[PDB]
Structures are given as C-alpha cells and as structure tokens.
Symmetry: D3
Subunit: 251 residues, 6 copies
C-alpha cells in the first residue's frame, strides 16, 4: 500500500497521473510552488515528494537522485501508484559549439552509456521519448523565449570518465571512453547527462510516457565562465518550461 522507497500511498497522490521528476531534492519545492496548493508528502534518501494541482488536476513532483539506478526506483514506484507520464527537467553539459549556456535541449533520443537501461530492454532498443511529451516540451520551451535544440543526448553512468573528463585523481579514462567526446560531437550529439537513457528506455518499454528537457549550464567547448544572473535565469526558466509542458500534457 505504501511503496518501499518513496513513502507515499496512492491516496496521497489525489489521483495524479503525471509526475515532474527533477534530480535534486531541493528543486522539488521550487517546481511545486509554480502550481497550486503544493504540499510536502515525504522525504526519504534522495526522494522528496510533493503534490500540487495544475489546472485543477493533481501533479506529483518527485526527485530522482543522480543516476539511472535511483531514477529507476522512483519511476517504478510512482507507476505502481498510478503515474503514467514522467517529465524530467535537469541540467546538462553541451558538447556542441553552437549551443549556448541558457539554451534549452529537448532530448529526441539518448546514447545508452548507462547500465540500468539494460535491465528493461536490450541495447538494440532505442532510448527515445514519447512523441507527445517531446512535442509539448518543445512548444513550452519555445514559448518561454529560449533558444531550443532538439537532438541526441549522451547519457552516462559516470560524471567523470564516461564524460571523458581527465582532470581527476588518476587522470585516466578507460579504453572504451578514450576519444569518445569527439566521437559524439562528430555524430551530432548535443550534450551529456546521467539519467535520460534509463528513464527513456524504461518508460518506452513499459507503457509509460516520458521526456527530458534541460537547461545548458556549461559548454565543454567554451572554456569561459557563464554569467551568474544567466545561470539563475536558466534554472528558473527550466522549471517554468517543464510546468508549462505538463499543462500541455494534461489538456
């Protein structure tokens, strides 16, 4: 009756069938307060859960933590409680020079550099969003005035070697990932993050609608530090966008 990790029951969600799923627990209240009647439900580990109302309909907001494994738990347990549509909002590192800090990326497919996706579908299966969710996210992102990019995201189980970072304790990257950032760049991949491959694969193979939208907080090719106000505005815009995408999905 109460799911194992999230600490909520189906009745606690007041009929919600849509969830907004940021990674950071501290972002949950910030998203919920953009909607009506936000109420804290539970916090356990990296999972902070609020309910709110959007155009009269109940919406969940639930953090996922970093990575596919923790994300997979939250999605499963929300689905046990009746949630069928999942909107991820997150941050990302662009790897294309034409993408600027402050722009928004809607993922059309993920490079599966994770492990949890394989626990739902073999590697051949595409990590792709639900087309209605991606469509709603693009429209919401455009309506906010942001420059919006649609494209492929590389989704890594690590922050460091799987994103080909060398400024580390060992300074090494395993053979698999040596030269990988240039390979993705040349294949037109827009950005790196750590959860979309798991989220999209598990939802596309399980009868759940999912999509991902993110604000760009860094460009791996532009070694300049983005303006502070710009970072804060991007954060605020990203969560405005995801709430407006949720509105479009509720009709």
């Amino acid at each position: 009756k109460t799911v194992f990790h999230l600490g909520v029951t189906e009745a606690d969600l007041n009929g919600a069938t849509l969830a907004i799923i940021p990674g950071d627990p501290a972002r949950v209240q910030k998203i919920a307060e953009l909607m009506d009647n936000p109420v804290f439900l539970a916090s356990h580990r990296e999972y902070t859960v609020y309910r709110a109302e959007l155009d009269g309909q109940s919406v969940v907001v639930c953090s996922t933590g970093i990575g596919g494994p923790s994300t997979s738990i939250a999605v499963e347990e929300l689905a046990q409680l009746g949630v069928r549509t999942f909107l991820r909002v997150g941050t990302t590192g662009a790897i294309q020079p034409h993408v600027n800090v402050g722009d928004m990326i809607v993922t059309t497919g993920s490079v599966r550099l994770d492990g949890a996706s394989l626990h739902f579908a073999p590697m051949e299966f595409p990590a792709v969003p639900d087309f209605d969710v991606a469509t709603a996210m693009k429209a919401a992102a455009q309506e906010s005035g942001a420059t919006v990019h649609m494209g492929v995201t590389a989704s890594s189980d690590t922050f460091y070697p799987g994103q080909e970072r060398y400024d580390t304790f060992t300074g090494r990257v395993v053979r698999r990932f040596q030269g990988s950032m240039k390979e993705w760049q040349d294949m037109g991949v827009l950005n790196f993050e750590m959860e979309s491959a798991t989220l999209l694969t598990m939802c596309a193979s399980s009868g759940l609608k999912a999509g991902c939208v993110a604000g760009v907080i860094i460009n791996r090719t532009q070694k300049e530090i983005p303006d502070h106000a710009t970072l804060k505005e991007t954060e605020a815009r990203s969560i405005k966008v995801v709430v407006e995408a949720a509105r479009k999905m509720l009709k």
Copy 2:
C-alpha cells in the same frame, strides 16, 4: 559532373533537389513521382530507380533503396554526395500489436536495431531515432489525410524471416536470439517490423542528415505470417500520398 557510383545520376540531374523520397520497391518510384509535377525518369540500375519531380516549384528526387540496410546505405550516401539532406522513407510493415490494422500508417519514433549496417555508422548504444521535424511532418501528413496513424517504436530486422520470428519457412528454425522475440517486442510496446529504418535512422542521425520513416501496415502478425495480396494496392496508394504531403511540409 561525374555520376555517383551506384545510382547513375549527377548533381545536375537532381535539378537542385535537397529532399529525397526513398521507397524500397523500384516500382513505387514512378508512382510517387507522378503524384508531383514534371516527373522525369533519371536512371535505373540494380535496385536503384531514380526520378525527379517538382513539388510546389521545388525539385524532389525519388530513389528506391532495395530491401535492407546495406542497399539503403548506398543510396543515402550517394544522394548526400549530390546535396540531398532530407530523406523520407515510405515502406510497408507488419504490425506486432493486435489493435494496429491493415491499412493503418505507422510513423517511427525510434527503431530497435536488429540490423548490421547501423553499426557501421554508430555503436549500438546510439539511438536509431528520426529527425524531429521529419517525424512531425509525417505525423501531420498522415493525420491530415484521415488515416489511422500510430507513433512509436519499430523493430528493424536484417531478415524478413527469422529476425521477424517467422516459422513458416524451409527449416522452421529460429535462432535462440529471436525465439520468443515477437512477444517480447509486443510486451515492450513495439508497433511493427520492417527492415530499413534502423540503418537509415542511425546513419542519418549520426551524419548530419534529416530522416524519418512512415509505413503502411500490410499484415497483422498476431494473425499470420504472409501478407495477403488483395490489400497491398490500396495500402500502398495511401502510403505514397502521405509521404508526398510530408515532403511538402518539409520544403523550404
């Protein structure tokens, strides 16, 4: 001024086209071209029949691919060499879901890579996904036409027979990898089987080209394995009308 190696056409032959409609069957090429203005035969060699036509005053090239990723990859490469940047696949397909009926249209949002040629462009982790603008145009064309349209995942196989878990064959054998695969895909929500989309979509998405796929359902695999001939012509006619309208939506 030289011709490309397989297709037998020059850049001048394309008369400025930067969009191609790429059916599988050579016989569909003239049919598609004749839905547009000023259709002109360009060349035919092997499985590659090539026409040019005009749509709203803009040149479009129509080029068959043959069956499978290998022959498709050649056509896409050589057309890209001549300046084509947008590729609209139209084909036939077998439905894996019980509710998806003969004559319905499927627009692929991603492909299960049950092919080999896709791996010659990107490792298996890379998603076989369409360009979002092309998929959007295909959906709109299909829906505006009054068709019954499904968006979703397609299983794209290097074989017609074992890789689509057909048993009515010479040996009746399906290798271990493919035993029980149709029900697995069905349970995962996959809509349909075809043979070219994983290669096309992977190649294009990793090469700076815009591609999508739309297909008419010619069989429901929860019923049987071999498509009935009687419904092929009407489904084909619908499919090619849709793809030409999708091309119109992609112009300029």
Copy 3:
C-alpha cells in the same frame, strides 16, 4: 503456392534443385543464356528469376540484390521451392597486392561484418562454404585459364565505412572500422564484398550447399586503373565459370 517476394511457384522451377545467384538483376539473363532453353519466370523488386537447363537438368538463376538482407529472402524462398544448392557469382575488391584485376577468388570462409548472418547462427559459427561447391568452383575457375585464389573474404553490410572508405559525404569511419582494412590485410584476407557472410552462414546452418566465386574488378592497393577490355573479359569469364561449376555439381 507462389512465394511472396520472388513470385514463382515450385512447378515454375521444373524440378530445379540448384540456383545460380548473382547480385544484379541484369546479369540473370546473361547467365541463363549460357545454358539451354532459358525462360523468364518473374521480376519483382531486385529479384529477376529465370529457369534454364544444364546437361538436361533444370537450373534456376535468381538475382539477390545488394546485401545480406535481400539475399536471405531469395535463398529462403528458393529453398521453400526445393532448391538445395546455391552458387553465388559476384564482383570483388582485392586488398592483397598479389591478387591482380582479372584473377578469381573462391571464398573459403567469410569475416562476418554483416547483421543477417546473426539471424541464422551466433557469431561463433563459421561462415564457410560447402566443400563440394568450393571444390567445383576452384576447378571451373582453373579450367577457364584464370589465376585463382582460395581464401578468406571480408563481408560487409556497407560499401563505404565497412570497407574503410573515407571518400564519402562525412569522411568519417566509426571506431570499429578504423584501421580495419590493414588489419584484414595483415590477417591474409583477400577481398571485400557484401553478401557472402549471410549466404554462407544461412546455408551452412540450414542444410543447404553454398559457395561464392568472384572476379577481381579492383585492387585497393594498386594505383593503376584496369582497362575496359580486361574488365569485360573478367565479367564474361566469371559467369562462364559459375555455369561450369554448376555442371560439376549436377554430376
């Protein structure tokens, strides 16, 4: 009782149990006319089908198209209609300096750089010809006066990156295939083509006899461009050779 792609019936084949399978539909009639009583049966898609008679026995000639996928359909449908022996005749690109334009290659095994072979047997299984077919092809090739090479062929699902060609739209070759031509050269591989891995694997694992013979039309290591007469002679000799190999198989 008409097979779906080829558009022929068992009765149309007049008892044939052997097929010659070129890639190009335009070559079918050219092979058939080397035999007695050639008759056109059907043309659909890349599949042009003739029957003929060789030493009083019926023989099919059927094109395959380019690649393993289209080849696999033709072989399957012909086997449904009683064909048990398949003789492929094709063109090939040599990658060894000692193999000249105009020589012939009989494949003793194929490097499986395809996908369709995996739909018949896992990768561990060898893509090898039937020993009687390969023996007949060698004998026929030698009897035509050609210089014949027996050895391994690399069989690719692509013409361009899987044969390590860089003169392409993108100019890139995926990691897997970077350096691959030199690797195959050092391993003694003779040539590239695009169908043998599928053909040989599907037949060797399905109770069908198969082999491949090819005339060398280019050498990836030679700057010289072969002349028109040499190429024309090679094309003609290849199809004479495959018909004489068929004669040896029928007794």
Copy 4:
C-alpha cells in the same frame, strides 16, 4: 585549494583523513560519525552528507553515496581528489541463500557486475574485488562482534526491481537477461543482492584505492517469515559498529 564539485568540502576540511566510511543513506552519516570522537558536520548537498570525526586520534571521513553506482562513483572520485585512499562501505543487503539469516553479516569477496558504472573504469573481464587488507579487517571486525559472518560473492545490480528478479511490479515482467537470474545466482553460491559494490570495488581496484563492503542482512528472498522490529534495529546498529571497528583495524 579547491572545493570539489559535488561534495562541498576542501582538503583542509578533512584534517588529513585518508580513510572514509561510505554508507548509502545520508541519514546514517551522523550516526556513524557519533560512534567516533569529536564528530563535525562538514556539508550536505543532494545525496552527499559529509562529516569528519576522530578514531584513535586520527581523522576519518564519513560520506554518504546515494543509491547506485553513478552517485557512488562521484563521491569516491571527489574524496580521492582530497586525499582519501581507503573506502569502507557499510550497507544493507538481501540474502538469496536459505542458510543466511536476517541479522547475519556479509563481507563481499567479489561482486557480480550487473551495473554500468564499473565499465567506465575497467572492461567486464576485470574482477570487482575488494582490497585484501580491507576485506580481512571487515571479516575480523564482523566476527569479533559475535555475528555470524559469511564471506562470498554479491550480485550488484543497477536496479532494485528487474535486476533483482522482482515481479511484484507495475509491469510484472523482467527482460530476458534477468529471467531466471536469481536461481542462477543461487545455484552459483551468490549470497546477496545490493546496488553499489560492483562500481565501488571495480573503480577502486583499478585506480589504486583500497575498498571493501560489509553489510547486515535485513531480508532473505527465500524466507516468508517477516523479521521483527527489534531484530532489524539490532542489525542496523551492529553494522555500523562493525564498520567503525574495521576502520580502526585499517588505521596505520
């Protein structure tokens, strides 16, 4: 003197610590720290709560990891940048063998790599193995506590549900790879499931860092009896006392 990106601490904040105790749950950090002397809260961000304390006069870090290899890998990397060389994981686990009882303790001698992050450090052939000195210290601490201690292989999964072959789920299905997997691991002698050890052990064993894992058994997948509140409370308390004693044995 940098602050690492996620953990929010500097090298100076660690007061020379070269050993960290790494529980999964942020709420357990303070409890472990308070078993030692002069615990000091350093930082909390996302799933990473960081304390310092003193053990026999030497500084020790306690830092939570979150659930899964990905978040664990960040914490280990950033601690290593700040001079930590020895990592002692204390966690909870589900036994899969009938002879292992709730309240027993498991010291992992190797992990089945059912994760993804381990592959970001070493190819699959590489063993997910603890440092022998750490495993020795954990065995000794666990046995000295009076617990029944099992040394053996742990299955380390990127999921809680299908990768541990759970069917009481939204879909009720498990992908082919994991169908029948619990029985296969049982027959191979595997003791338990958890979600972080493959990543931790592989990354440390291939990076010059010393690591090990000890866990109290809180459930047994083969027993229908439900353990009572007091047994669970004792097990949790024992686990963290054991890991602190193992840390004492590692101090030089």
Copy 5:
C-alpha cells in the same frame, strides 16, 4: 636458440616445414614410427617432439595437449622454427546420428566456443582450414576406405559444460550452453572437440596452413558402446590418414 616450451632448436628439425600435431604426447612416437628414421627430440610438459622423414623430407611430430591454450604455444614455437604447415589429428565425438564410430571427419570450419582464437582474430573471423590441407586430408581419408564427412565442428574450451554434459559434479550447465547440443545438431554441426577453433583461427590469420582430421570415437546420440577392436582400428586409421595427408602436402 632453443624455444622455451618445446625445448628444440631450428637445427633439430633438419629443415622441416610441416608438422603433424596430435593432442596426446603418447601418440607422437606412434606417428613418427609410421615414417622413416624417427628421432626423439624432446619432451617437456604436454609437448613431446619427434622428427622423421617422409619421402626423403623432414617432418616434425609434436603433441599439443588438451585445449587451445597449450596448442597455441606449440604452433607459435614451431612457426618460430620454420614450420608453416600444421596437420592436426585428433579424436572427436559425433553429434549427428548419421556419423558412426570409426568414420573420419575433416573440419571445414569451427564454431569458436573457445577463448584463445580471440587472441588472434575477432569473433567475426572464420575458423577455417587452409583449402590445400583440407583437400589433402579428405583425399587421404577417402583413399583409406573410411567413411568421411566434411563439415562444421564445435570447438569447446571445456569437455563438460561446453559440450552440454550433465553427468557432472554439479549437474549444472550455464545458460549459454543449455540446449546448445540440439542447436548445433539442428545447424548441421558434425562433432565436438577442443582445439580446432584455436588452431584454425591462429593459422588462418597468421600466414600458416592448417587443417584438422579426426576419428570418431563416440557418438553422443548412440547408446551402444564401441568395442575395443573398433576403437583400435579407428586410432590406427587416423594416424595412417594424417601421414598420407602429409605426403600429399609435400609434393
């Protein structure tokens, strides 16, 4: 210069460029004694080495031990000493009902169920014999009066689970190998052994000529136990055949 494992020098081989390579050290002297002037050279570990003369030419006989790893050492060291042609004679278990005890098998390709082959070529590469050696072995085997089968052999790194034996300590076969004997049977594979995949792959990728011939000593589908005389005749036949195959390779 004395090779580390085999304990012989190039001069010890008296110009031999062909080796016969049985598995069992005890067979080496028996094979050598079928030729002229047999001379014991060395014995270390599983490697017993003789030289003899066949039609006036030097031939080495060297045992391999069980498995690809020990075989790979012997082949490498013999190649260092000038050997270019390797004729394996061994024993095998048939898996097809039509293959009887006392028949001979000449492998046309091997299913690579080993590990050492991967140390020479990726899995896509075919484990196939040199065509001349396979031809010589077929001729020698057929001329002896034996019933001879040409076809695919499954070459396993284990005797027990990789050959799907359940009469074992655990009674367990890992998932990969469950159902495998029936799969190979249905694919037309003739037999199991433990060395050919390594031998054939390493030689075919290294410029060395190799082949395998084996006497059938058991059939996994038969319940009758072969009698002592049949087994003795099969052993004797096998080594006579390999020597006659060597004679066909000299000239």
Copy 6:
C-alpha cells in the same frame, strides 16, 4: 564406484582426500607429494599425473593440470566427482609491475578473465575470485617461508603470446583487443600474467568448491619476454614448500 574419464582413478584411490594441490607441470607432482607422508603414484594419462599423500594424517591429492583453462577444467571437474572440495594451485607467473622481483610470490585476489573456459561456468559479470580462507592460508604460508609476497589482481590469458602482449613472435602482431593491454593492466594495478586462474577461480566459485592460486615470479616483463628454465629451479622449490604449508593450514 566410477572411474573418471581422464584421470584414471576412483574415489577409493584417494583415501578420503578432500583437498588437492594442482600444479601445471606433471613433473612437479611427485616433487610436491614427496614433501608429504606416504606418497603413492596413482595414474598418469596425457598431462595428468596423479599422486596421493598424507599431510598431518589427512589424505591429499596432487594432480597436474597442464597448461591453460581447458585442461585445468577437466582435472578440477573429475577431482570434484571423486570428492575433492578444496583446490590449491601453484604455478609460475610473469610480473608486470616493475617493483616485483623474480623469486617473489603472488597470491591472486581476483583474476582478469582473458580466457574462454570461465564463460562455460559463469557469465563474464561473475568475479574470478578465490576462496577467502585459501587466499589467507596462501599469504600466511608465503610470508612464513621468508618470501616477498604480493596480494592482488592477476591477468589470466588463454595464450602465452598475444594475450600477454608478447611481440617477439613469428608474426610480431598482436590483435587489436590486446594492443596496449599490458600497459592498461599495469596502470590498473594488475600484478602479473598467467594462464589458469580465471578458469580455476570462476569454475570453483560458481560450483561450491574452494580454490586459490599462488605463483612464483619467473620473469619481470619490465625487462624481457622469455623466461629461462634456470631461474625456474630455485623459484620452484620455495613455491612447492609454500603450497604444502598452505594446504596444512587449510586442513587444520
């Protein structure tokens, strides 16, 4: 009352032995047995020479394995059929870390699975790790002999030549997979190369058998590729003394 297929012995011939010492070379078998009481020759066939002896009143088998995982797997299986449950491998090895000296001993804590036979017992994800008691006994016995002992990861290859990245060979070629591999392993902290531990440890850890490996260093790959039989002799007397003393510790 079965006689096993390759080893040519029955369970009664072993006089109750449940522990085996398993060197590679048949010539070491009698040398090991004579360090124990009442050694008796049992059988010799192919690379398998089998003796029994008594250690502190308990029966012990000594059985050679040959080179490589395949032949080792046969001996272990057949000995287990005859009641053996603990397997102590002694062998030779090449060091890949500069600081390890010829004559040192290495006790494997886990193996890199660069073999094939291990996959016939467990999928690649499964760790090739020793029984903790056996590894502990081998460490203690090695230290007590006065040897310099190293504990760590071993790379276990199905070849002597390319899989150990040796270039002084007939072709001078190493396949892509293994190019750069020695440096890769050295940077990951791997101590040494040998050819049997991956198979032995995986087989046993997945089959309810206790196993470990100790090896004398006969070459350092920082200097050269080819060992020599002379360095073998001294390194070999101490190796076999150590493995017998490890056996004594396992029987106590």
